[PDB]
Design a protein around this ligand. Structure first.
Ligand code: SZD
Ligand code: SZD
Lengths: 544, 544
């Protein structure tokens, strides 16, 4: 009974005396382990499996049986587990092994339940829910429509709030809004269990998502609503529609830009080449890429009080046509106009089409890789940036590893160790003349859990851009003089509870400053607040 | 809540109306399936996995989530699932993936709990337990001592009673008696959770197993105690110690011989060469091999009332020295003396050492392979048996497939389709001149579940050899004139519920005849009893 409840089950960590008192002697093998010992054992069971998917499968069974031991194992091996319990293994689990999510707590909405969303939420009988992750399985990167099987993404993202910021696992809810799927295999699959129809048009999409947002605000009024893995046709428009009326954010848009900005500003500090001296090529010009550039500018403006106009003029935006300029003769998308050069002639614009010739002309000190078109940061291009700065900042952020603008290894090799690198993926260290270099990974885990924990405590009426900017600055500042001396751009991933506690404290203080905080119990000074936030976090240890 | 209880959970088989009434709308994807549809889906999820162990792993997750759907899938695909859910996959799961059994109901005994066995049983809080499978992980075949990890064998054997004879899954208990392990890897393994010591001596072994047998008879008085996968130093002695005082049997010894005897007698019928005309080489002379020969003799004596002495003289026992004879000049083990030739000279015995020369001299009509020494039934040997009968009976029963005396394919090929074959493993059909041949598999599943179900209903004071002989004859008789016309030696495996119902009926009637039956509610005429037994069986269908 104790054993069959994954929240209180301790398995072999029940002492002999506990086993007699609880009447479970002879329900376990006789060895008694500490949690630490159970973690080392589970870690061995995981590494016995070869393929990421089989490792995920084993971990799902641990989560089903002993939740405390699951989260304890993730926290002890976080850098190594991350690619198994989320991107990119979780997407493969959704696409071909969706049965791995059947047993998980989860809430399914579709048009058949129109008008009943609030009843379905009430019926789930959750207490004071703090975090709700919602997807429609459409995919931010637009690859592999998962439809209903998108529930696996919400389940995996919810587990990262629990591991990263000690959101209590009983107080988090994964949600799929099934509005159909354009996945042709799934539409013909006899074993697809979701709505077997093409994705709904915008009017019906927004009718169901409006009902979702209103139901959640009434039935789960304490919750942060986080949008995950929505396609580009909707994700930006969703934030515009809801950002002021509901407590909501989108991690792919707002999280990514907070994390990259914090790392980029620490790269600037190590470079010696100060922010107004940086010449930054933004390779890629989607809404997301422009969003990150704007987040870098907003952060440098907050931290340093340079005029934001002067920071915007450090950016050279490159789209598929070439350098984005006002003299190019094309009609620019709204999002490209802000970062468009005003200082480049029509004649020069005509000769600024390939990344090689753009780099030669611009003489950048930074390359930001947000391009999603493979390895465009060639050896020749990296050698040219070496002419312009002693410390080239090179950020190949396009995912996955095959779409990356350059390998950290090549970046370090070509610069003889001078490159300051951040990556969107983990990479092993590179050694050059006995000296070791490792890229700093801008993982989204640095920001969303702390935002969730801060918004859970502070209960703000909404999440304005001030709170994401505060979280970005908080993260930047947690990189210690020592971390910086070793070339690290972020605090260490394995210190995520402390990082989340700090990010959360800083978010609450910003909400208090703006007077949007609904929880009057919280300390309002940083030292006392930080202590309070750390005590509020759920810890994966045997409690009782 | 309904969903988290594996006994009542129906998953997607809950109708839309049921989902509203039970307040679980939005806890499932929206498709509604019948059980049949769920089975086809689970069957596809299983075949997506390549290796037997990964298939077992998926099935363990089904068993954990929806028990009705698990048993429904096994029953629909029984011949194909059998090698995944028991021998030989289950042993590999015990040896290297013992975590697959952690979540299962199971009872662990060891010397540390001496004097508390009855308290541990009471504390498990089972109702009217019907079947208890116990092992010590020593292994009947003496390969791969599993120690504590032997619990996986008891768990898999218990699932075969539920699938085979509709023992209610709540009324069956898997047990490991951990008396240590001689597995050197395990003794040094930091993740072994069992008693980390060499196997106890006989005196302490029997102290703990006596306490087990007495505790079970008091706390689980309705149960059949089945011994599984005990080593040869103990398994025979255990039956001698307990057979009269407790309701117990050993499937490896008693089950195997019941199944092989039933098949062998049907092989005799197809051969035309009647039982007193058979000349049978018993290749292998362990206690087990001799037990099977004695079970064949006892069955032919029951069915046909030939003097058993005349049946015993149809057997030519071959041990590692050669033909077992009284003139050989060695001191015979007790178990070999019964089947020893009295009709062969010292001089002939000296020239009867190789199987080839023994076959040439004996001119057998049957070869029984119980030898465990690879493929000794050579083409030359099979050609010689063709000189002695138009229908050679060839039974390569040694496990696994590599230790087998001959492949059914070779047997059929070498005899041009004349061979009557039973196997200890499933084999695909062989086609010769457009005519198809398939060996009859003597699976233990034909007998133990029906014995368990019969002993569960009849509640006999004990299980004397009469009840195993009745079960053997029952099985033999269920092979229909039609089955026999197609060369089948057993009723079809997929008809296991009917086979178990019949075997059980016949066992009860024998217990009633002997007046050892404690349940006075049962019909005492076969037609009415059979109907009653079928109604008592738990069925893997959604009930409520
Ligand atoms: O908790 C139980 N058993 C247990 C036996 C050994 C060890 C442990 S443990 O908690 O100490 N370790 C552990 C756990 C589960 C894991 O995942 C996996 F392997 F089961 F998939 C891995 C390790 C736990 C248990 C739970 C029940 F609901 C019923 C029951 F009868 C037993
Ligand atoms: O039963 C639940 N979900 C379910 C979702 C789709 C289908 C089904 S099903 O029962 O129709 N099929 C099915 C099942 C489990 C299987 O095994 C495996 F994949 F989970 F390992 C395979 C198939 C079942 C469920 C159980 C809970 F305890 C909590 C919860 F929130 C949901």
């Amino acid at each position: 009974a104790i054993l069959t409840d994954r929240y209180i089950n301790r398995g072999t960590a029940f002492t002999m005396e506990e086993r007699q008192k609880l009447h479970i002697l002879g329900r376990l093998p006789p060895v008694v382990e500490t949690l630490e010992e159970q973690v080392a054992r589970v870690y061995g069971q995981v590494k016995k499996y070869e393929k990421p998917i089989n490792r995920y499968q084993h971990l799902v069974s641990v989560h089903s049986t002993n939740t405390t031991l699951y989260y304890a194992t993730i926290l002890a091996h976080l850098e190594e587990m991350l690619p198994i319990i989320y991107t990119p293994t979780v997407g493969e689990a959704c696409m071909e092994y969706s049965h791995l999510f059947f047993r998980e707590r989860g809430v399914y909405f579709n048009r058949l339940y129109k008008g009943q969303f609030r009843n379905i939420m009430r019926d789930a009988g959750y207490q004071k829910v703090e975090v709700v992750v919602i997807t429609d399985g459409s995919r931010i990167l637009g690859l592999g429509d998962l439809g209903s099987n998108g529930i696996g993404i919400s389940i995996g993202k919810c587990s990262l709030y629990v591991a990263g910021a000690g959101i209590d696992p009983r107080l988090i809810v994964p949600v799929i809004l099934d509005v159909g799927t354009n996945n042709e295999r799934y539409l013909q699959d006899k074993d697809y269990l979701g709505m077997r129809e093409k994705r709904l048009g915008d009017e019906e999409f927004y009718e169901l998502l409006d009902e979702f947002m209103e139901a959640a605000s009434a039935e789960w009024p304490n919750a942060v609503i986080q949008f995950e893995d929505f396609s580009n046709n909707h994700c930006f428009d969703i934030m515009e529609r809801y950002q002021k009326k509901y407590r909501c954010f989108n991690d792919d848009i707002q999280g990514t830009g907070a994390v990259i900005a914090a790392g980029f500003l620490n790269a600037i500090k190590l470079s010696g080449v100060s922010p107004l001296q940086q010449r930054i090529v933004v390779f890629g010009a989607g809404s997301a890429a422009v969003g990150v550039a704007n987040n870098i500018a907003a952060l440098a403006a907050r931290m340093y009080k340079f005029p934001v106009q002067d920071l915007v003029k450090t950016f050279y935006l490159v789209d598929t046509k070439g350098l984005v300029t006002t003299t190019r003769g094309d009609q620019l998308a709204a999002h490209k106009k802000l970062l468009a050069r005003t200082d480049v002639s029509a004649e020069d614009s005509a000769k600024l089409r390939t990344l090689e010739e753009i780099v030669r002309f611009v003489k950048p000190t930074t390359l930001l890789g947000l391009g999603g078109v493979g390895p465009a940061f060639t050896e020749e291009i990296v050698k040219m940036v070496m002419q312009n700065t002693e410390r080239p900042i090179i950020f190949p952020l396009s995912n996955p590893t095959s779409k990356a603008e350059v390998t950290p290894e090549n970046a370090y090799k070509w610069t003889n160790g001078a490159a300051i690198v951040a990556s969107g993926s983990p990479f092993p260290p590179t050694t050059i003349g006995g000296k070791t270099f490792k890229p700093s990974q801008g993982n989204n885990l640095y920001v969303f859990p702390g935002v969730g924990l801060g918004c859970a405590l502070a209960q703000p009426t909404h999440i304005p851009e001030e709170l994401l900017l505060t979280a970005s600055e908080s993260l930047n500042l947690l990189t210690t003089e020592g971390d910086l001396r070793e070339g690290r751009l972020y605090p260490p991933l394995e210190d995520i509870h402390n990082i989340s506690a700090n990010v959360a404290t800083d978010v609450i203080l910003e909400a208090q400053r703006m007077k949007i905080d609904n929880n009057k119990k919280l300390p309002r000074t940083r030292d006392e607040l930080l202590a309070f936030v750390k005590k509020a976090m759920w810890k994966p240890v045997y409690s009782g």
